[PDB]
Amino acid sequence: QSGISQTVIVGPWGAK
Amino acid sequence: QSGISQTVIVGPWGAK
Amino acid sequence: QSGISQTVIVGPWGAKSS
Amino acid sequence: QSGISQTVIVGPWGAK
Amino acid sequence: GKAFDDGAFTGIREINLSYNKETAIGDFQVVYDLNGSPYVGQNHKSFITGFTPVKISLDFPSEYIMEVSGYTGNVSGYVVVRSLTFKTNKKTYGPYGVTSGTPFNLPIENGLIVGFKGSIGYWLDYFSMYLSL
Amino acid sequence: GKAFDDGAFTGIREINLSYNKETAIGDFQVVYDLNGSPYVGQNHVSFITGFTPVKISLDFPSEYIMEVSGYTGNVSGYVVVRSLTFKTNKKTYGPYGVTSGTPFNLPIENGLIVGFKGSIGYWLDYFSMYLSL
Amino acid sequence: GKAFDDGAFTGIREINLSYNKETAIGDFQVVYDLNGSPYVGQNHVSFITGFTPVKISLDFPSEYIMEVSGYTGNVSGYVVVRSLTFKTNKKTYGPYGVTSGTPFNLPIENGLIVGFKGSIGYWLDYFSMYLSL
Amino acid sequence: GKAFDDGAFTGIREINLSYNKETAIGDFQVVYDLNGSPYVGQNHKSFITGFTPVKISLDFPSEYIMEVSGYTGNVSGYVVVRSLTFKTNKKTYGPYGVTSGTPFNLPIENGLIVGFKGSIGYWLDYFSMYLSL
Numbered sequence: 023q024s025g026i027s028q029t030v031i032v033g034p035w036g037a038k
Numbered sequence: 039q040s041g042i043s044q045t046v047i048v049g050p051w052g053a054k
Numbered sequence: 055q056s057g058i059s060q061t062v063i064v065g066p067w068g069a070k071s072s
Numbered sequence: 073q074s075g076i077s078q079t080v081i082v083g084p085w086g087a088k
Numbered sequence: 089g090k091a092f093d094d095g096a097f098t099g100i101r102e103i104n105l106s107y108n109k110e111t112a113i114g115d116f117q118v119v120y121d122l123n124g125s126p127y128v129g130q131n132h133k134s135f136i137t138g139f140t141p142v143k144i145s146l147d148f149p150s151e152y153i154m155e156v157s158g159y160t161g162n163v164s165g166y167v168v169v170r171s172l173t174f175k176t177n178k179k180t181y182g183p184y185g186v187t188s189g190t191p192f193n194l195p196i197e198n199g200l201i202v203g204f205k206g207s208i209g210y211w212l213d214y215f216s217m218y219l220s221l
Numbered sequence: 222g223k224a225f226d227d228g229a230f231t232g233i234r235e236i237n238l239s240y241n242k243e244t245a246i247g248d249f250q251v252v253y254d255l256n257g258s259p260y261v262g263q264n265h266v267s268f269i270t271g272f273t274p275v276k277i278s279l280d281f282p283s284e285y286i287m288e289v290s291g292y293t294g295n296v297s298g299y300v301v302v303r304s305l306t307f308k309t310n311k312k313t314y315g316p317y318g319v320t321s322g323t324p325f326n327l328p329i330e331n332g333l334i335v336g337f338k339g340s341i342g343y344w345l346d347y348f349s350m351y352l353s354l
Numbered sequence: 355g356k357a358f359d360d361g362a363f364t365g366i367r368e369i370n371l372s373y374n375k376e377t378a379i380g381d382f383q384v385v386y387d388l389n390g391s392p393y394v395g396q397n398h399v400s401f402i403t404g405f406t407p408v409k410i411s412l413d414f415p416s417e418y419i420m421e422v423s424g425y426t427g428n429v430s431g432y433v434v435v436r437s438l439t440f441k442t443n444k445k446t447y448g449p450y451g452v453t454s455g456t457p458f459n460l461p462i463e464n465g466l467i468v469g470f471k472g473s474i475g476y477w478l479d480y481f482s483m484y485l486s487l
Numbered sequence: 488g489k490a491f492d493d494g495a496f497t498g499i500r501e502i503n504l505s506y507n508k509e510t511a512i513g514d515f516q517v518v519y520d521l522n523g524s525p526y527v528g529q530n531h532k533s534f535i536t537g538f539t540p541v542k543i544s545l546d547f548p549s550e551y552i553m554e555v556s557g558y559t560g561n562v563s564g565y566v567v568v569r570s571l572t573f574k575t576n577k578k579t580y581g582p583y584g585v586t587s588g589t590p591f592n593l594p595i596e597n598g599l600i601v602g603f604k605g606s607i608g609y610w611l612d613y614f615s616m617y618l619s620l
């Protein structure tokens with residue numbers, strides 16, 4: 023792994 | 039706390 | 055709930071707190 | 073990335 | 089309708105649903121992954137019949153859902169989920185049902201859908217999804 | 222537009238955005254909570270002016286966002302976020318902007334929005350949200 | 355020894371282990387909770403017998419483990435887990451085994467133990483725990 | 488001692504602590520990563536002086552802590568943290584302080600340390616760690 027914390031991310035909404 | 043694990047829940051979509 | 059995010063916390067090690 | 077959910081894992085304790 | 093809650097698992101292996109080209113989504117059942125082993129969820133069936141069955145077999149764990157979209161609308165006086173579409177990192181499954189009404193969509197940039205809950209009477213009334221890393 | 226990514230924090234205290242009721246959302250800035258202390262996020266501004274400012278001050282931590290909804294659609298040739306509405310456990314803020322086009326909505330049964338990322342040119346091109354327990 | 359990995363679940367309902375006052379921990383089995391339904395984990399047994407069985411029945415979900423402690427040491431030339439103690443918000447179970455060797459302890463301020471993995475030969479060689487909110 | 492709680496961040500860039508080969512750990516300060524940018528945490532200092540400073544600069548984000556170990560024990564009639572050792576995927580830092588008393592160790596198979604909390608009077612009374620994926 024990397025030393026960076028992760029989080030759930032939803033989206034995007036809008037332009038592709 | 040309760041001994042029950044939690045998780046993110048999104049929704050609902052549909053009837054209210 | 056509350057508007058504050060939570061994370062797992064392990065410990066403490068050292069003087070007793072509970 | 074993986075279709076497999078992950079969890080924090082601590083240890084091991086005992087034999088290396 | 090009759091509410092259901094499958095709970096949270098390790099991943100998704102297969103989705104089985106049924107729909108009617110003139111009404112909405114009917115039956116819904118999921119085969120989850122539970123720590124590397126398939127776990128068959130309870131079949132949540134409509135109070136009626138006459139639906140067309142669909143089997144979505146994912147190539148777990150390399151293939152996973154990245155977006156769920158659909159439409160909600162009135163059917164016989166009831167607001168229900170009329171259509172569903174599942175997009176994975178490999179292909180698009182759907183749309184299944186009627187693409188009319190109010191659209192909705194849940195794209196996921198990071199994370200996984202690991203469970204479903206909702207209610208089904210004559211049709212799928214509503215549903216929610218469990219998300220996790 | 223110019224992409225931005227605020228990252229994840231502990232919660233949301235205030236949202237400052239600007240919009241034009243005849244076009245779309247413009248500026249976007251968030252005051253996050255960072256472990257009990259306010260953290261002023263970078264102000265992501267539109268390339269143009271003429272927007273109406275709005276300050277959404279939440280009664281943190283008792284008040285939090287339970288649903289985000291809005292509309293996307295064209296403004297000239299570009300697909301952008303035309304309108305946004307924020308619903309908390311206390312009040313509904315908005316809608317702000319053109320309430321026409323393709324709707325989208327994200328209701329949260331369990332969890333919290335803890336960050337934003339997206340892109341802004343003349344208008345808010347797109348955006349995503351970080352979710353956490 | 356023979357490695358095992360139960361994986362992660364919703365919680366813990368019961369722990370069944372065995373020990374010997376002169377050696378170390380032997381058998382290990384857990385009855386987990388899986389979205390409200392008990393799930394019997396595989397019984398991980400020692401290659402030998404002569405152990406004293408212990409059943410720890412928790413008052414799920416009001417009672418849960420807050421700290422796991424124990425000792426690791428040499429037994430017949432093998433480094434193994436010689437003792438275990440489980441402290442919940444209601445009581446302390448143990449110590450089971452011999453409290454000689456190098457101690458270890460895992461207190462939890464926030465979160466839950468939701469799974470176990472490890473290895474067992476004549477005795478419990480080592481183990482790890484899955485943690486989650 | 489005086490309690491402190493830095494909270495949770497996105498990673499760890501640098502740890503600054505001080506110790507005394509005859510007593511225990513004194514001062515403790517951490518430079519966290521906050522969504523790609525360094526964030527200097529408050530310096531938690533001992534009520535007294537005479538400690539030897541130590542700077543642990545990690546090669547973020549390629550280098551991260553995989554195990555924290557140490558010793559707790561009595562000093563002047565108080566139970567305190569006498570020694571600490573930080574093992575990363577690249578190097579071992581420490582032990583710093585007196586390696587006498589009761590040992591403790593926290594190996595991490597999956598996850599990251601993203602924050603610290605504790606208390607400091609003459610010495611570090613106790614400490615806990617925030618964990619995340």
Ligand SMILES: OC[C@H]1O[C@@H](O)[C@H](O)[C@@H](O)[C@H]1O
Nearest residue numbers: 089135166208209210211213
């Ligand atoms: O599916 C839509 C509706 O179906 C009916 O059978 C049921 O009585 C309603 O409560 C609602 O579920």
Ligand SMILES: OC[C@H]1O[C@@H](O)[C@H](O)[C@@H](O)[C@H]1O
Nearest residue numbers: 222268299341342343344346
């Ligand atoms: O916001 C709509 C558009 O604004 C323009 O200024 C930019 O060049 C486009 O890339 C797009 O962002």
Ligand SMILES: OC[C@H]1O[C@@H](O)[C@H](O)[C@@H](O)[C@H]1O
Nearest residue numbers: 355401432474475476477479
């Ligand atoms: O349990 C301690 C030992 O037990 C033996 O039976 C096994 O062959 C060893 O590898 C070690 O596991």
Ligand SMILES: OC[C@H]1O[C@@H](O)[C@H](O)[C@@H](O)[C@H]1O
Nearest residue numbers: 488534565607608609610612
């Ligand atoms: O650090 C050891 C001790 O230091 C003293 O200064 C303080 O009054 C105690 O509460 C304890 O913290």
